[PDB]
From a paper:
We refer to this variant as Kif5bMoNeXXX. Currently, there is no atomistic model of the MT-bound kinesin-1 motor in the ADP state. Thus, our ~2.9 Å resolution ADP-Kif5bMoNeXXX structure fills an important gap in knowledge. Noticeably, whilst ADP is present in its binding pocket, density for Mg2+ is absent, despite its clear presence at the N-site of α-tubulin. Yet, while Mg2+ density is absent, ADP is clearly present, indicating that MT binding drastically reduces motor affinity for the ion, but has, together with Mg2+ release, a comparatively less pronounced effect on ADP. Overall, considering the apo-like conformation of our MT-bound and ADP-bound Kif5bMoNeXXX structure, we believe to have captured kinesin-1 in the pre-ADP release ‘strong’ MT-binding state, induced by Mg2+ dissociation. Our structure of ADP-loaded [name] bound to its MT track captured the ‘strong’ MT-bound state of the motor after Mg2+ dissociation and before ADP release, allowing us to describe a structural model for the two-step mechanism of MT-stimulated ADP release.
Kinesin-1 (also known as conventional kinesin) is an essential ATP-driven molecular motor of the kinesin superfamily capable of processive movement as stepping dimers toward the (+)-end of polarized microtubules (MTs). Using engineered stalkless chimeric constructs of human Kif5, we present here MT-bound cryo-EM structures that explain key aspects of kinesin-1’s mechanochemical cycle and autoinhibition.
Numbering used by the authors:
A (entry chain B): 1 to 44, 47 to 360, 369 to 436
B (entry chain A): 1 to 37, 47 to 437
C (entry chain K): 8 to 194, 199 to 323
Write the structure that this text describes.
Amino acid sequence: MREIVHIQAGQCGNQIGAKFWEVISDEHGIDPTGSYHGDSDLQLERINVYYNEAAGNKYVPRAILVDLEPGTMDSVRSGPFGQIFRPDNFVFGQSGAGNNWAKGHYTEGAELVDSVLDVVRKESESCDCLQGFQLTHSLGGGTGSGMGTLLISKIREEYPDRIMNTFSVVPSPKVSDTVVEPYNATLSVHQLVENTDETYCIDNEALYDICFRTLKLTTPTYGDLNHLVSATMSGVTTCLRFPGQLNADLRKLAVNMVPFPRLHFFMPGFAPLTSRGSQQYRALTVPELTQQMFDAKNMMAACDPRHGRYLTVAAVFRGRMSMKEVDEQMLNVQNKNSSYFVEWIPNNVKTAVCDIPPRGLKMSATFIGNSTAIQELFKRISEQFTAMFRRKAFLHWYTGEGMDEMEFTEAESNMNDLVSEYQQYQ
Amino acid sequence: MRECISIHVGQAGVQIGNACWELYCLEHGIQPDGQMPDSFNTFFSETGAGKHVPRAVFVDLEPTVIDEVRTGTYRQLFHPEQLITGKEDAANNYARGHYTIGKEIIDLVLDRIRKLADQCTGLQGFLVFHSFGGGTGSGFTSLLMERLSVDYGKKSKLEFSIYPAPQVSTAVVEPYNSILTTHTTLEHSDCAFMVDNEAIYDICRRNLDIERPTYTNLNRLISQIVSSITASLRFDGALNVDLTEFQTNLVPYPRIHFPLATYAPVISAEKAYHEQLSVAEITNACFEPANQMVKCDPRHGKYMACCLLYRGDVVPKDVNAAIATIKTKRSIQFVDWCPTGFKVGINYQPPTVVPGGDLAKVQRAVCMLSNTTAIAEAWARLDHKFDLMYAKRAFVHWYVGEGMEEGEFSEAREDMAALEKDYEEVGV
Amino acid sequence: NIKVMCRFRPLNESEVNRGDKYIAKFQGEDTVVIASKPYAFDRVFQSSTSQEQVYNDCAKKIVKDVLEGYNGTIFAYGQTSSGKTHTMEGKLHDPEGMGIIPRIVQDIFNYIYSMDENLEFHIKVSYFEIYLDKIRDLLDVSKTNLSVHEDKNRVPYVKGCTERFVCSPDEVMDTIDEGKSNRHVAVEHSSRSHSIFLINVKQENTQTEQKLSGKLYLVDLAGSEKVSKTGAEGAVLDEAKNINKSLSALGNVISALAEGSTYVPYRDSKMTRILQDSLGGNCRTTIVICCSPSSYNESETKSTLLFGQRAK
Ligand SMILES: CC(=O)O[C@H]1C(=O)[C@@]2(C)[C@H]([C@H](OC(=O)c3ccccc3)[C@]3(O)C[C@H](OC(=O)[C@H](O)[C@@H](NC(=O)c4ccccc4)c4ccccc4)C(C)=C1C3(C)C)[C@]1(OC(C)=O)CO[C@@H]1C[C@@H]2O
Ligand SMILES: Nc1nc2c(ncn2[C@@H]2O[C@H](COP(=O)(O)OP(=O)(O)OP(=O)(O)O)[C@@H](O)[C@H]2O)c(=O)[nH]1
Ligand SMILES: Nc1nc2c(ncn2[C@@H]2O[C@H](COP(=O)(O)OP(=O)(O)O)[C@@H](O)[C@H]2O)c(=O)[nH]1
Ligand SMILES: Nc1ncnc2c1ncn2[C@@H]1O[C@H](COP(=O)(O)OP(=O)(O)O)[C@@H](O)[C@H]1O
Ligand SMILES: [Mg+2]
């Protein structure tokens, strides 16, 4: 009943997915061995969305882990929750992508994508009613970008009437670890804009900013970043497995949030976020969640919504709360900030309410937004791309695998057309 | 005999039905298991072992809310085949609920209704609860109404709907669904009651003194209104009026069939004392512009007809005095072609209180249903919203990818314009 | 600039026995009144109109312009049994019954047979269809999933399509017949895929060393279907969904072009992407919508007229 198949590609995707599965298993009361040690029936009521049953009351995730190197695989396998995954769903090669989009999209990923498609097809035929697919990856690397793009294309060709939502970590301006990041990011967006239904944009800079400022953490590591991302991933699909006063599914959020087919790039957010030693001084009410959600310094994308207008906003609430308060807050947010919302669309906000809060909290909320301010991200990527492409720098690592310069020019033109599309409604 | 069939389609309909059936069970002394330790035949049928099964059908394209009904405290009350559920919902799309996902459980609900209608001798009408602006509640209701009109035809159909509010809204694509469904509800319905949530929030805040209401209070109020409508069929009293009398005294012309409901007194326990709460005081409160369950002041319009329903300890002399006082006032306008504009009904059964509720134990209550020319303001607001969104043709690609042409939008907008011009021309 | 013409047809004998009534009322030469609702176009023909007048008022200027190195596009929209094939094919050999395509090829070759001897001509012909959002070649059934790419001057083109040379009108008619043999057609003769025909006329002067290139597009669109009134199940429903979405996308592009919008959404469909060069800019495009005046076909006529009005 509305099952979700999960795919993790590359190092970033695999680590985010491991954190996500730990969080989801904690929410559903599942031990690392796959056993159930919960305290409520609602935990097991809709466990078929994310888990597959086994003999003797054991649950195996519907996840497929794919990489071109075994190091992340055997780092994930030996972790706290590595014993929960099916050993047959680990698909890996031996020669890595080498931070090359062309390699992972054409040469090494082509010889590995048949196995991934086979395991996906086996997993998807065991579903009573499929709802969509999830992919976690990074645009700036080689295996993530190219291989996930190829997988998305193949899956969209096979199943054209299903949701495809991706949580893609986007290259950041002030934080960088690769020299050939712009090439990969451009060549990846050129395909995401065509073969995806809704893509969530995340960058490490905003996550670092949240950790340093809101959480007051001293030395943040990748665990905290992956933890924030996992929290938002869990919050997106809370209405598929718990009851509530208003129910919103994936297709509902796509219908309400996407006015035109190209415009499906979102910036996520979460609330509440406080620091240890500062939760006793704060009251947790619906106004506080609303105030924190629409704050510029809480989005997980390194874009300022004040430099643009919202086309649509989706707010998903968890806990026990009044509908009058939610409606009033979502109306006064628009009334007070009329200069940040598109005029010809009335009621830019959609509300969903679920009645089971996250463990250890009384209330929570997730924020999905579609703003024209996302065009500055693509502008920076395009600027770097054009700067590096005039000299044809680092271009023989790509033309040595079976690529062409015309592909680069087409990707650049597609990105420019997307930017011009978004700029119209500003 | 006198029996009704209730349909609750969509999440809003199912929740309203939960409230309604809890209320009916408390009224008739029926435990949640169908055993009571002849005034219930309109809403219940005996099975021969003492069990009572409601004449209800619950429908939704999503397996969530009906599942809460299936494992709740009323799980042994409903026939397991009356609760019908699908696989995937309409996703706020009229077309999905109309054809693509509609043409999969429509035959099943039709078969269930045919089974229910064959087990009742004197069918009186249908009571359909749904929501404008949703996917299922707007699309699946259109298909269901079309087939029922084809099949039964002569039986009456009364619709209880949730209309979009002027300011408060939940979805982004509500105007499209509302326009299409209000084009569908003109031809097939016989009497339509529209209530918006913002007015009920205002009523809850001002009268009952609850600052943070939820959907349960709204559903309790709506259930009270429906029970006041059906009291005449269920119980006995002086001047009992049934469905056909309401229709013949409330609908002047075939298309002018969109009344506004009101209830009185909605008072709290603390303020229940300190007040006389007489017949005249209750009647006067039903014409105030702040007690209306739609966002429309009747002072910007003219009344055509109103039917007043009294339950409890009421005497006809007091009703006549109250009618005379109302007729004396100047702020209340009646059309020149309806010199007598009142229909009076009295029932001896006082309202029932539900444990864990906000309404107080009163000794008498009224429920006025009136069709005015002031119901055209909300339609105008919704049309403005629709045309603003449709000028850019936003979200239209979702609707045409499910097999819907682009001319349906223009046709429905034209139908709404024609209806508005009628309510304006009949007003003068 | 965009010109929209509407051509009606006389009631046939097979429907004169049913007592069907004419519904169309003509005002002047640019409006038609159906159900007391005006519908304004650039020119509205009547049943007495001849084929030659349609050619002279719809496609002569485009044919002359293409010969001067420019581009042009001609659409054709209609429901089944509405006059589409008669207006854009007609009798293939009757001098008084030929439609638009044979007249175009006749004029294009009469130009060649009368232009000195220092000019060299080559005619390239392509023919492909769009079925279920997939480009397919009608001259070679092996290719079925072609793609759209760009050149250096960002002028889109279809990669791998068959392009064959022709030297006489007979060859063009033969290739048209061969292409129509492989078009997806429902069970009377209803089309379920869009069809595009390219005639590339390139001339090179040997003396002045000047080259001119012109492309002419002839699009035969499929008609929108109201699924609720038909009962589509299976592949028919998928075809109906795809057709409706594509037609709406084309309407959006044409409206954006006519209203002078800064951004034109050429990339929201396969078809509009292909015709990026031949739709905007200094190109002449006309739309011919064909309807029927029978009372039995009021709704389909209304839909066709509404689609034509969407252009404006
Ligand atoms: C005493 C008390 O109330 O402690 C809170 C707490 O102090 C705060 C600061 C928590 C705390 O979170 C963090 O410090 C944190 C660390 C890394 C990354 C992200 C956050 C908390 O650790 C996190 C924890 O969150 C949960 O329990 C949620 O269910 C959360 N769980 C996990 O992320 C998780 C962690 C480890 C193992 C398994 C799951 C969740 C959120 C969304 C979706 C699913 C689950 C909570 C409320 C607390 C502590 C313990 C201090 C905060 O986080 C969350 C996710 O609730 C940080 O800002 C919020 C506000 C909370 O009040
Ligand atoms: N009174 C009341 N109104 C509700 C309730 N739930 C939703 N609504 C209203 O209904 C509208 C949303 O439509 P829904 O009924 O939830 O949608 P649906 O009919 O289930 O259709 P889909 O979910 O899209 O398949 C909004 O205007 C809500 O305010 C409820 O429980 N009580
Ligand atoms: N949040 C998070 N980001 C990561 C992690 N590892 C790498 N990244 C980011 O991912 C990008 C590098 O791509 P990477 O996945 O390592 O290359 P790949 O292994 O070839 O796919 C850089 O922007 C890194 O900051 C991780 O564990 N967590
Ligand atoms: N304008 C017209 N004048 C006279 N006859 C016409 C006209 N349009 C169509 N017809 C007649 O209609 C017949 C079939 O039309 P057809 O081209 O098959 O339409 P469609 O292709 O839409 O089914 C032709 O034999 C032709 O004689
Ligand atoms: Mg629902």
